[PDB]
Ligand binder design. Structure first.
Ligand code: BCL
Ligand code: BCL
Ligand code: BCL
Ligand SMILES: CC[C@H]1c2cc3[nH]c4c(c3C)C(=O)[C@H](C(=O)OC)c4c3nc(cc4[nH]c(cc(n2)[C@@H]1C)c(C(C)=O)c4C)[C@@H](C)[C@@H]3CCC(=O)OC/C=C(\C)CCC[C@H](C)CCC[C@H](C)CCCC(C)C
Ligand SMILES: CC[C@H]1c2cc3[nH]c4c(c3C)C(=O)[C@H](C(=O)OC)c4c3nc(cc4[nH]c(cc(n2)[C@@H]1C)c(C(C)=O)c4C)[C@@H](C)[C@@H]3CCC(=O)OC/C=C(\C)CCC[C@H](C)CCC[C@H](C)CCCC(C)C
Ligand SMILES: CC[C@H]1c2cc3[nH]c4c(c3C)C(=O)[C@H](C(=O)OC)c4c3nc(cc4[nH]c(cc(n2)[C@@H]1C)c(C(C)=O)c4C)[C@@H](C)[C@@H]3CCC(=O)OC/C=C(\C)CCC[C@H](C)CCC[C@H](C)CCCC(C)C
Ligand SMILES: COC1=C(OC)C(=O)C(C/C=C(\C)CC/C=C(\C)CC/C=C(\C)CC/C=C(\C)CC/C=C(\C)CC/C=C(\C)CC/C=C(/C)CC/C=C(\C)CC/C=C(\C)CCC=C(C)C)=C(C)C1=O
Ligand SMILES: COC1=C(OC)C(=O)C(C/C=C(\C)CC/C=C(\C)CC/C=C(\C)CC/C=C(\C)CC/C=C(\C)CC/C=C(\C)CC/C=C(\C)CC/C=C(\C)CC/C=C(\C)CCC=C(C)C)=C(C)C1=O
Ligand code: HEM
Ligand SMILES: COC(C)(C)C(=O)C/C=C(\C)CC/C=C(\C)CC/C=C(\C)CCCC/C(C)=C\CCC(C)CC/C=C(\C)CCC=C(C)C
Ligand SMILES: [Fe+3]
Lengths: 325, 102, 255, 182, 76, 51, 102, 51
C-alpha cells in the first residue's frame, strides 16, 4: 500500500539548534547541553533540551517538591516507616482533609494542618508556573493564548480547592491527596448531592469534552491526509494559500455542507477545549450552595423520565428458575 | 432498558452450597409424643429449658444435632464448663430469632 | 435559597446567560472562517444569487517577515488560475466537469495546483528552507535505510534510475525530497519526489503513484540549489494526479 | 437502520477522499467510533445473551442506563481499562488546547509586530518544558491519542460483563496478596 | 540496526511468557505471574538492546575510532 | 594492590564523586529508616518508654 | 453486596438512592435485617462471652467479643443454604413456649 | 588460562566496569534482603527475642 506517514523511514542528524533570540537576550538564562534520542525520532523530533531557567520556574519546582515530600513523608509515617508496606499500600494511602468540626479555623497537625500547608505550597507552585508561561510569551513577542488556556483549567482547580470550601464555610470540603481516595471523593460527592448527571453544567462540560476529542481526531486525520501537499506547514499555508488547504476545505464542504480555513479551525479547537473546565467549575460552584438535590431539581423542572414497569426480580423470574433447579 | 440486572456465570450457578449435603446427612424426623411419655427431667439431671422434652427428643437433639453442628463432641456433659452455659443461652436466642423475627 | 419568580433561580439565570453567550460565540466563530473563498459563484463564473445567512467579516492585516509586504483579508483571490481546460457536461449547475486535453499535463482535477508566489520559503536567518544534502554542512544519516544509490521502481515495475541526493529541511532536521537521476531511455535530467509518496526498501525505492512513461514530464526546478513554492505545488500535485489518471482502471468504478 | 447509515457515511467519505486524491485517514478514524458503538449495541448483548442489554434511545434516559450499569459492579472507578481511557481522554484534551494556543499565538502577534514561523514555536516549547515534538509529530500524537481513547473505552465496556462478574475493587487482590510481601 | 533491537524485544517477550508459565508451575496465579513476566520483558529487553545492539559492527574502524577519542582527550 | 591509582585514567573523577556522594547519602538514609522501622532499635520509642 | 453476593441494582435504583417509590421488595427485608442484627448483637451475643469466653478468643485490639453480621448467616449467598427448610424437622427450636408437634 | 588478558582486547573496560559495579551491589542487596526475609537468619528479630 501507499506510505501512511506514521513512522519516519530514514532519520538525519545535524548540529543542535540553540534557539532564536532578540534584544531581550533569552540566551543568558538558557542552559548548555543537548541530547538526541533515536527512539523518539521515529515519531517526532530527536533533540532534547535545552530549557529556560527563570525565577518563576525555580520557585515552582522547589515549592512543588516541598508539597510532594510532605505528602510522601506523611504517607510513609502513617504506615510505621515500613518500606515493604509503603510499597504494598501505595495506591491506598492519602493525606486527608481536615474534619468538619473545625470549620474554617486552622486544625491541628494530626487532623489537617499538614494538609493546609501542602495545599498552600501547591497553590504557590501553580501560580508561579502560570506566571512563567505568561512571561515567556511576553519575551518572545507572541500572543498570550497559552496563558489563557492554562487559566481556564486553573479556574476549575481553584473552584474545586479554594472557592467552594470558603463559600461552604469548611476546609473539609476539599479533595484528599491520593490515587483511590480521590476517586472515592468523586463518587461520594456525586452520591451526596443527588445525581450529577442531572446537573446541566456537567452535561455541558461532557458535551465540550466529547467535542474536543472528536475535533482532534478529525484534525489529525485531515492533516495527515493532505501531508503529501506539504499540509503540515500550516503557517505558510495561512500566509500563502496552497492546494492542501483547498483540498482539506473541500473535503469537509462536500461531506457536511460547511468547512473552515487553515487558521479558523484552531480557533474552534481552542474554544472547545477551554469551554470544558469553565462550565465544570460553574456547575460545581452551584452544588450545595444553591441546589442540594439535582434529581429533585430535574423533577421540578420537568425533564426527569418516568417508567411504567415494576421493580424486583420476582416480577420477571423466579429464584429457583435463575439457579436452574 | 434501565440497565438493572445481576450477571452470573453459568458454571457457577450449577454449583450448590457445599454445606447443604452435610446438613441433610445429620438431620432426622421428629418423634410424636405419646400418652404419658417419660420426660428427660425424670431420667437425668439437666437444665430447665431442656427438661420438659421427651427422652427420644433429647436424644436426637442433643447428640445427633448439636454435638455435630457445632463440632464439640462433649457438649452439655459437664454443667460447669463455659461451653454448656453458652449453649443454653444460644438455644433461647435461636428460639427468639425463629419466633419474634418471622 | 429562594426563587425570583416561579421556578427561576440562580442556576436558571446562569444557564440562560450561557445560552446567549454561546449563540454569540457561534456567530463569531462561523464569521471568522469566511476569509477565504467568498463571495460564492455559480458554474459559469458569475456571482450567485444566494450568498447565505452569514455576512462577510471585516478586514484584518498581516505583517509578514523579510520585507515581503502585508496581506489583508478578506480580499481578492491572488491564487486564481487563469485558463482552465475544462468543459461542462450539463447546461445547469451541480454536474461534473470534463477535461479537454491531458489532465496530468493541464493541472486539472486531482492534479490541480495553486498559483503561489514564485519565491522560496525562508527560515529565520533568511536562507532557503529546503537545501540539498550535499550543501548542508554537518548533516548525515543517523537511522533507517540510506536510499542514496538505490534504483527506483515505478508503478508498473520499471526501473527508471538511481537515487542521487536528498533535499533536507535544515531548520527542522527532516527530509523533504528525494532526487532522481533518469536513465537516457526514460528521459533526461533530474526529477524530485516528495518523501510522503515513496517506500524505501533494502534494495529499492518504489513509487506507486505514476508509471514509467510519466517520469519524463515531471516539472523541473529552474535552479539546481533551491525550489520555489509554485514549483513544489506543481511537482507535488503532478505526483498526486497519478493515483487517478495514470490508468483507465483507476478512474472507472471498482465494483 | 443506524448501523447501515453509519457504514454508508464512512464509505461516502472514502469516495470523497478518492475523488480528491488524498489519504484515507478520516474514514479509518471514523471506523473506531463505529466499532465502539457496535461493541455497545451488538457485541456485548450478543455475548451476554439478550438484546435487552443495549442502551435506550433517549436524551435523558440513556444516562440512567449508564448509571445503573456502572453501579452493577460496586465501584466502576476501580476498572483499570476505565483508568486508561480516562487518562487518554484528558491527555487528548490537553494536547488539543496546547496545539491550538501555540498556532494561534504564532499567527497572531501583538499589534505592530511581524508574524512568526515554526522556528519560533520550537524555541518556545523547548524554553517552556525542554522538548518540542515538531509540527508533524503533534498531529500523529493527537490522532493516536484519540484512537487509543476509543479503543480502550471499547475494551473497558466489553470486559465488564462477559469476562468479570464480581466487584471491581476485588480484582486487586492479586497485588494485595503477592507471595513476595512479608 | 533496528532489526536487532526488534529481535531483542521479541526475545524479551518470549522470556516474559516463559517466566509467566513457570510462575504458574510454581503455584502463583495468572496475574501475579503476568506482572513479573512483564517486568522481565521490559528489563531484559532493554538491557539486551542497549548492550548487545550497542556493539555495532567494526573490526579495525573501532580501534582508530577509539584511538581518535584518546587524542581529543588529554588536551581539552 | 599498589597499582590501584590507575582507575582515574579510566573514569572521570567528577561523575564518580557525584555518584559516590549520592549513593552514600541514600544508603545512609535508607539504613536509618530501616532501623526506625523496627521496635527493638526505635530510639525515640525506647526513650518514651523509659520515662 | 459482598455478603449477599449481589450488586447495587439489587434493591436499588441508582438514579435516586433515597426515593421509596423506586425500591424493590428486598429493601424492606434488608431494613428488617438491620434491626434484627442490632438486637442480636446488643441483647444476646455481647452480654454473654463477656462472662464465660476464655481470653484466647477476644481479638487483637480492645479485647472485644466476636460479633455477628449478614455474612455470619448468608456466607456469600442470596439466602442461607440457598433457601433450605431447616426448621420443619426441629419444632423445639421454633417457639419459646412448649413445642408444637402438630 | 594464561591468555585470559585478551578479553580486554575485545570488551570495553569502562562499560564492563560499570555493569559489574551495578551487578555486584544489586546481588549483595538481594542476598541480604533474602536473608532478612526468613525467621532463622533475621538478626533484627533475634536481638529482640533474646532481649
Ligand atoms: C456510575 C458511572 C460510572 C461510569 C460508568 C461507565 C460506563 C458503564 C461506561 C463508561 C464509559 C466511559 N467512561 Mg466512565 N463511568 C463513570 C464516570 C466517568 C468519569 C469521571 C467520574 O470523571 C470519566 C472521565 C468517565 C469516562 C468514560 C470514558 C472512558 C467512556 C466513554 C465512552 C466514549 O466516549 O466512547 C465514545 C464512543 C461512542 C459511543 C461514540 C458513538 C458515535 C456514533 C458512531 C456516531 C453518532 C451519530 C449521530 C447519531 C448523528 C446524528 C446527528 C445529526 C447532526 C442529526 N467515566 C462512573 C464512575 N463509564 C462508557 C464506555 O466506555 O463506553 C464504551 C460506558 O458505557
Ligand atoms: C460517580 C461519578 C460522577 C461524576 C462526578 C464528577 C465530579 C465530582 C466531577 C466530574 C467532572 C467531570 N466529569 Mg463527571 N461524573 C460522572 C460521570 C461522567 C462521565 C461518564 C459516566 O461518562 C463523563 C464523560 C464525565 C466526565 C467529566 C468531565 C466532563 C468533567 C471534568 C472536567 C475536566 O476538565 O477535568 C479535567 C481536570 C482538570 C482540569 C483538573 C484541574 C487540573 C489542574 C490544572 C492540575 C494542576 C497540575 C498539578 C498541580 C501538577 C501535577 C504534577 C505534574 C507532573 C508537574 N463524568 C458521574 C455521574 N464528574 C468535574 C466537573 O467539572 O464536573 C462539573 C468534577 O469535578
Ligand atoms: C544496630 C546497628 C546497625 C548498623 C547501623 C548503621 C547505621 C545507622 C549506619 C550504618 C553505616 C554503615 N554500616 Mg553499620 N550497622 C550495623 C552493623 C553493620 C555491619 C555488620 C555486618 O555488623 C556492617 C558490615 C555494616 C556496614 C556499614 C557500612 C556499610 C556503613 C559505614 C561504613 C561505610 O559506609 O564504608 C564502608 C566500608 C569501608 C569502605 C571502609 C573499609 C574498611 C572499614 C574499616 C570497615 C568498617 C565498616 C563498618 C562500619 C564496620 C562494621 C563491622 C562489624 C561487623 C560491625 N554495619 C547494625 C546492623 N550502620 C553508616 C553508613 O554510612 O551507612 C550508609 C550509617 O549511617
Ligand atoms: C507533559 C509536559 C511536562 C514535561 C515534559 C517533558 N520534559 C522534558 C521532556 C518532556 C516530554 C523531555 O523529553 C526532556 C528530557 O530530557 O527528557 C529526558 C525534558 C526536560 N524537562 C526538564 C525539566 C522539567 N520539565 C518540567 C515541565 C514539564 N515536563 C511539563 C509539566 C518541569 C517542572 C514541572 O518543573 C521540570 C523540572 C529537564 C529534566 C529536561 C530538559 C532537558 C535538558 O535541559 O537537557 C537534556 C539533555 C541532555 C543533557 C541529554 C538527554 C537526557 C537523557 C535523560 C540522558 C541520555 C539519554 C539519551 C541521550 C536519549 C534519551 C532516551 C529517551 C527515551 C528519553
Ligand atoms: C483546557 C483544559 C485542559 C488543560 C490545559 C492545560 N494544562 C496545562 C496547560 C494547559 C493549557 C499548560 O500550559 C501547562 C503545561 O505546562 O503544559 C505543558 C499545563 C499543565 N497541566 C498539567 C496537569 C494536568 N492537566 C489536566 C487537565 C487539563 N489541563 C485539561 C484537560 C489534568 C487532569 C486531571 O486531567 C492534569 C493532571 C501539568 C502537566 C501542567 C502544569 C505544571 C505545573 O503546574 O507544574 C507546577 C510544578 C510542580 C507541581 C512541581 C512538581 C515537581 C515534581 C515532584 C518533579 C518535577 C516534575 C517532573 C517532570 C515529574 C517527575 C519526572 C520523573 C522522571 C522524576
Ligand atoms: C474516537 C473517535 C471520536 C470521534 C471520531 C469521529 N466522529 C466522526 C468522524 C470522526 C473521525 C467523522 O468523520 C464524522 C463526521 O463527519 O464528523 C463531522 C463523525 C461523526 N460523529 C458524530 C458525532 C459523535 N461523535 C462522537 C464521538 C467521537 N467522534 C469519538 C470521541 C460522539 C460522542 C457521543 O461522543 C458523537 C455524538 C457525527 C456528528 C458525525 C457523523 C454522524 C452522521 O451523520 O452519521 C450519518 C447519520 C445520520 C445523518 C443520522 C442517522 C440517524 C439514525 C438512523 C437514527 C438515530 C439512531 C441513534 C442510535 C439515536 C441515538 C439517540 C441518543 C439520544 C441516545
Ligand atoms: C485544517 O483542515 C480542516 C478544515 O479545513 C480548513 C476543516 O474545515 C475542518 C472541519 C471542521 C469544522 C468545520 C469545525 C466545526 C465542526 C464541528 C463542530 C463538528 C461537529 C459537526 C456538526 C454537529 C455538523 C455535522 C452535520 C451533519 C453530519 C449533517 C449534515 C448532513 C446532511 C444535511 C445530509 C447529507 C446529504 C446527503 C447524504 C446528500 C443528499 C442525498 C441524496 C440522495 C440526494 C437526492 C436528493 C434529495 C434526497 C432531495 C434534496 C435533498 C436535500 C435538500 C438535503 C437536505 C435534506 C433534508 C431532509 C433536510 C477540519 C477538522 C480540518 O482539519
Ligand atoms: C505548532 O505545533 C506544535 C509543536 O511543534 C512546533 C510542538 O512542539 C508542541 C509541543 C508539544 C509537545 C512537547 C508534546 C505535547 C504532548 C502531550 C501534551 C502529551 C504527550 C503524551 C504523553 C505524556 C503520554 C500520555 C499517555 C499515557 C500516560 C498513557 C500510557 C500509554 C502510553 C504512553 C502509550 C505543540 C503543542 C504544537 O502545537
Ligand atoms: C442487615 C442484615 C441482613 C441483610 C442485609 C440481609 C439480606 C437479606 C435479604 C434481602 C433477604 C431476602 C432475599 C430474597 O428475597 O431472596 C434475606 C433473607 C433471609 N436472611 Fe438475610 N440479611 C441480613 C442478615 C441476616 C441474618 C443475620 C440472618 C439470620 C439470623 C439472615 C437470614 C436470612 C434468611 C433465613 C433469609 C431467607 C428468607 C426467605 O426468603 O425465606 N439474614 N436476607
Ligand atoms: C517519602 O518517600 C519519598 C521521598 C520517595 C516521597 O516523597 C514519596 C512520595 C509519594 C509516594 C507521593 C505520592 C503522592 C500522590 C499519590 C499524590 C496525589 C495527589 C493528588 C491526587 C492531588 C490532588 C490535588 C488537588 C485536587 C484534586 C483539587 C484541587 C486542589 C487545590 C486547589 C489545592 C490548592 C489549595 C488551596 C488554595 C488551599 C490552601 C490553603 C490556604 C489557607 C491558603
Ligand atoms: Fe494544526
Amino acid at each position: 500500500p501507499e506510505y501512511q506517514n506514521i513512522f519516519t523511514q530514514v532519520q538525519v542528524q545535524g548540529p543542535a539548534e540553540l534557539g532564536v533570540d532578540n534584544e531581550n537576550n533569552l540566551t543568558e538564562e538558557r542552559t548548555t547541553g543537548t541530547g538526541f534520542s533515536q527512539l523518539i525520532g521515529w515519531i517526532g523530533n530527536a533533540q532534547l533540551g535545552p530549557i529556560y531557567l527563570g525565577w518563576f520556574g525555580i520557585i515552582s519546582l522547589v515549592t512543588g517538591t516541598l508539597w510532594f515530600n510532605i505528602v510522601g513523608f506523611n504517607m510513609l509515617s502513617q504506615v510505621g516507616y515500613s518500606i515493604p508496606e509503603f510499597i504494598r499500600q501505595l495506591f491506598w494511602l492519602a493525606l486527608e482533609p481536615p474534619s468538619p468540626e473545625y470549620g474554617l479555623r486552622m486544625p491541628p497537625l494530626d487532623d489537617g494542618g499538614w494538609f493546609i500547608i501542602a495545599s498552600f505550597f501547591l497553590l504557590v507552585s501553580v501560580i508561579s508556573w502560570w506566571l512563567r508561561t505568561y512571561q515567556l510569551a511576553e519575551m518572545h513577542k507572541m500572543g498570550k493564548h497559552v496563558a489563557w488556556a492554562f487559566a481556564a483549567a486553573i479556574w476549575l482547580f481553584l473552584v474545586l480547592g479554594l472557592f467552594r470550601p470558603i463559600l461552604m464555610g469548611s476546609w473539609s470540603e476539599a479533595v484528599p491527596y491520593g490515587i483511590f481516595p480521590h476517586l472515592d471523593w468523586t463518587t461520594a460527592f456525586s452520591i451526596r448531592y443527588g445525581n450529577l448527571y442531572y446537573n446541566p453544567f456537567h452535561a455541558l462540560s461532557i458535551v465540550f469534552l466529547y467535542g474536543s476529542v472528536l475535533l482532534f481526531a478529525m484534525h489529525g486525520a485531515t492533516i495527515l491526509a493532505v501531508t503529501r501537499f506539504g499540509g503540515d506547514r500550516e503557517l505558510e499555508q495561512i500566509y500563502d494559500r496552497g492546494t492542501a488547504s483547498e483540498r482539506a476545505g473541500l473535503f469537509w464542504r462536500w461531506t457536511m455542507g460547511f468547512n473552515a480555513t487553515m487558521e479558523g479551525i484552531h480557533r474552534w479547537a481552542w474554544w472547545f477545549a477551554v469551554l470544558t473546565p469553565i462550565t465544570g467549575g460553574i456547575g460545581i460552584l452551584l452544588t450545595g450552595t444553591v441546589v442540594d438535590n439535582w434529581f429533585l431539581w430535574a423533577v421540578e423542572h420537568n425533564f426527569a423520565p418516568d417508567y411504567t414497569q415494576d421493580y424486583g426480580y420476582e416480577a420477571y423470574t423466579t429464584y429457583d428458575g435463575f439457579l436452574g433447579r | 432498558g434501565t440497565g438493572m440486572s445481576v450477571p452470573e456465570f453459568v458454571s457457577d450457578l450449577d454449583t450448590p452450597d457445599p454445606t447443604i449435603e452435610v446438613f441433610l446427612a445429620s438431620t432426622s424426623d421428629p418423634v410424636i409424643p405419646e400418652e404419658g411419655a417419660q420426660t428427660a427431667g425424670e431420667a437425668y439431671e439437666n437444665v430447665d429449658p431442656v427438661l420438659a422434652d421427651l427422652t427420644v427428643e433429647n436424644y436426637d437433639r442433643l447428640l445427633a444435632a448439636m454435638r455435630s453442628w457445632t463440632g464439640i463432641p462433649d457438649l452439655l456433659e459437664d454443667p460447669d464448663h463455659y461451653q454448656s452455659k453458652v449453649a443454653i443461652n444460644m438455644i433461647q436466642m435461636n428460639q427468639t430469632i425463629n419466633e419474634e423475627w418471622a | 435559597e429562594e426563587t425570583f419568580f416561579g421556578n427561576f433561580d440562580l442556576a436558571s439565570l446562569s444557564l440562560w446567560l450561557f445560552y446567549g453567550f454561546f449563540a454569540l460565540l457561534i456567530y463569531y466563530l462561523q464569521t471568522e472562517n469566511m476569509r477565504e473563498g467568498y463571495p460564492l459563484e455559480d458554474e459559469d463564473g458569475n456571482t450567485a444569487a444566494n450568498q447565505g445567512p452569514f455576512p462577510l467579516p471585516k478586514e484584518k492585516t498581516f505583517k509578514l517577515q523579510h520585507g515581503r509586504g502585508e496581506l489583508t483579508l478578506p480580499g481578492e483571490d491572488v491564487q486564481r488560475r487563469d485558463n482552465l481546460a475544462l468543459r461542462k457536461t450539463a447546461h445547469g449547475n451541480g454536474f461534473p466537469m470534463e477535461p479537454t486535453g491531458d489532465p496530468m499535463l493541464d493541472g486539472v482535477g486531482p492534479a490541480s495546483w495553486s498559483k503561489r508566489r514564485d519565491v522560496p520559503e525562508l527560515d529565520a536567518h533568511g536562507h532557503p528552507k529546503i537545501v540539498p544534502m550535499s550543501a548542508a554542512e554537518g548533516f548525515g544519516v543517523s537511522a533507517g535505510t540510506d536510499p542514496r544509490g538505490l534504483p527506483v521502481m515505478a508503478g508498473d515495475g520499471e526501473i527508471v534510475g538511481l537515487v542521487s541526493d536528498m533535499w533536507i529541511d535544515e531548520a527542522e532536521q527532516l527530509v523533504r525530497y528525494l532526487e532522481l537521476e533518469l536513465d537516457p531511455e526514460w528521459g533526461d535530467g533530474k526529477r524530485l519526489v516528495q518523501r510522503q509518496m515513496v517506500r524505501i526498501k533494502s534494495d529499492r525505492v518504489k513509487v506507486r503513484s505514476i508509471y514509467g512513461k510519466h517520469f519524463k514530464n515531471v516539472p523541473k526546478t529552474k535552479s539546481p540549489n533551491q525550489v520555489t513554492l509554485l514549483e513544489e505545488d506543481k511537482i507535488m500535485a503532478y505526483y498526486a494526479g497519478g493515483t487517478l489518471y495514470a490508468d483507465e482502471s483507476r478512474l472507472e468504478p471498482q465494483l | 437502520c443506524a448501523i447501515g447509515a453509519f457504514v454508508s457515511w464512512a464509505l461516502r467519505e472514502v469516495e470523497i477522499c478518492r475523488k480528491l486524491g488524498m489519504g484515507y485517514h478520516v474514514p479509518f478514524a471514523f471506523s473506531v467510533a463505529i466499532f465502539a458503538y457496535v461493541t455497545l449495541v451488538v457485541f456485548r448483548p450478543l455475548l451476554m445473551g439478550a438484546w435487552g442489554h443495549g442502551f435506550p434511545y433517549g436524551i435523558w434516559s440513556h444516562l440512567d442506563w449508564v448509571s445503573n450499569t456502572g453501579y452493577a459492579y460496586l465501584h466502576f472507578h476501580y476498572n483499570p481499562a476505565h483508568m486508561l481511557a480516562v487518562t487518554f481522554f484528558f491527555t487528548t484534551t490537553l494536547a488539543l488546547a496546547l496545539h491550538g494556543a501555540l498556532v494561534l499565538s504564532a499567527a497572531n502577534p501583538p499589534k505592530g509586530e511581524e508574524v512568526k514561523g515554526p522556528d519560533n514555536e520550537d524555541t518556545f516549547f523547548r524554553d517552556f518544558i525542554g522538548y518540542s515534538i515538531g509540527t508533524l509529530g503533534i498531529h500523529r500524537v493527537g490522532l493516536l491519542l484519540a484512537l487509543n481513547a476509543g479503543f480502550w473505552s471499547a475494551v473497558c465496556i466489553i470486559i465488564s460483563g462477559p469476562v468479570w462478574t464480581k466487584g471491581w475493587p476485588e480484582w486487586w487482590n492479586w497485588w494485595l496478596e503477592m507471595p513476595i510481601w512479608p | 540496526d533496528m532489526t536487532c533491537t526488534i529481535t531483542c524485544w521479541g526475545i524479551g517477550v518470549l522470556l516474559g511468557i516463559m517466566t509467566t508459565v513457570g510462575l504458574m508451575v510454581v503455584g502463583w496465579s495468572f496475574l501475579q505471574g503476568a506482572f513479573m513476566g512483564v517486568l522481565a520483558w521490559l528489563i531484559v529487553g532493554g538491557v539486551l538492546a542497549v548492550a548487545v545492539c550497542g556493539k555495532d559492527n567494526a573490526e579495525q574502524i573501532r580501534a582508530e575510532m577509539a584511538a581518535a577519542r584518546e587524542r581529543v582527550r588529554g588536551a581539552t | 594492590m599498589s597499582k590501584f591509582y590507575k582507575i582515574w585514567l579510566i573514569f572521570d573523577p567528577r561523575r564518580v564523586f557525584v555518584a559516590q556522594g549520592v549513593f552514600l547519602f541514600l544508603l545512609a538514609a535508607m539504613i536509618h529508616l530501616v532501623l526506625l522501622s523496627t521496635e527493638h532499635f526505635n530510639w525515640f520509642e525506647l526513650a518514651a518508654a523509659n520515662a | 453486596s459482598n455478603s449477599l453476593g449481589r450488586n447495587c441494582v439489587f434493591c436499588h435504583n441508582s438514579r435516586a438512592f433515597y426515593d421509596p417509590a423506586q425500591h424493590t421488595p428486598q429493601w424492606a427485608t434488608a431494613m428488617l435485617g438491620i434491626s434484627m442484627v442490632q438486637e442480636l448483637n446488643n441483647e444476646w451475643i455481647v452480654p454473654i462471652g463477656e462472662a464465660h469466653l476464655p481470653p484466647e478468643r477476644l481479638g487483637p485490639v480492645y479485647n472485644d467479643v466476636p460479633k455477628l453480621a449478614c455474612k455470619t448467616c448468608h456466607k456469600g449467598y442470596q439466602q442461607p443454604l440457598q433457601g433450605l427448610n431447616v426448621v420443619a424437622d426441629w419444632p423445639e427450636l421454633a417457639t419459646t413456649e412448649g413445642p408444637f408437634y402438630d
